[PDB]
Design a binder for this molecule. Structure first.
Ligand SMILES: [Cl-]
Ligand SMILES: [Cl-]
Lengths: 137, 143
């Protein structure tokens, strides 16, 4: 009931001067745009550069917390939209082990995408969001 | 070892107009200023305000991950300074020495302490070498 997606670009909405994630939807030529805050966009911009920093930023520290508790990002789902807000699930995998070892966590789309970018974990978008909110470019 | 601290104040430096966290060192009249980024300062402000939001911000997400994995923030330690950089430890307690030391920036660790109520500690080296002892005249200037 959901399509694989990826970060195509992090654009700027020069009208609202705000960052816009453009998710590609696999199986389509449509994209789903998601508006995020400035600090979120900066963190995603840095994550997508995939470069080395001498000190852990917040999402890095999240990922270190997961690692320490023998878990990892399994996937990310952008599933719902109400009142201009997309709702995401960070699906975490408990590595103490069999598929019921997945934990769903409420997340904003920004945080989820950033963690998926950092980890290589898959992003999914629900059919319904694609049907109703994906766009052509 | 180390001294208990609390966030006395978060403000924009009145010259560089960037955030500085003044930590108070309990049991003293000393404070430790730590300069942080614009985004970290906003996150800390929201946390200090105990701002209630419909959606989880990044630090909230981290704390829900902790909770999901049966763990809590235990305490936070600002322990070293190297080339203008403070180094911290996020100490996590596995609720299932079940304590875990995780390297942190001071910003993140102070944010997570403020949100959870976990104690902030500063090492005696930092206090001895970097804290400053305020006179009332200097506290009034900050206030
Ligand atoms: Cl978001
Ligand atoms: Cl910092």
């Amino acid at each position: 009931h959901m399509r694989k997606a990826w970060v195509k670009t992090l654009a700027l909405d020069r009208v609202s001067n705000t960052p816009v994630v453009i998710l590609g939807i696999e199986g389509t030529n449509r994209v789903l745009p998601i508006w995020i805050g400035a600090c979120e966009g900066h963190a995603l911009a840095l994550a997508m550069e995939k470069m080395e920093f001498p000190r852990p930023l917040t999402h890095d520290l999240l990922l270190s917390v997961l690692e320490s508790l023998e878990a990892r990002v399994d996937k990310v789902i952008i599933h719902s939209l109400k009142d201009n807000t997309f709702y995401a699930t960070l699906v975490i995998r408990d590595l103490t082990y069999e598929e019921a070892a997945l934990i769903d966590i409420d997340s904003r789309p920004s945080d989820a995408i950033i963690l998926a970018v950092k980890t290589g974990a898959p992003i999914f978008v629900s059919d319904n969001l694609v049907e109703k909110h994906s766009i052509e470019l």
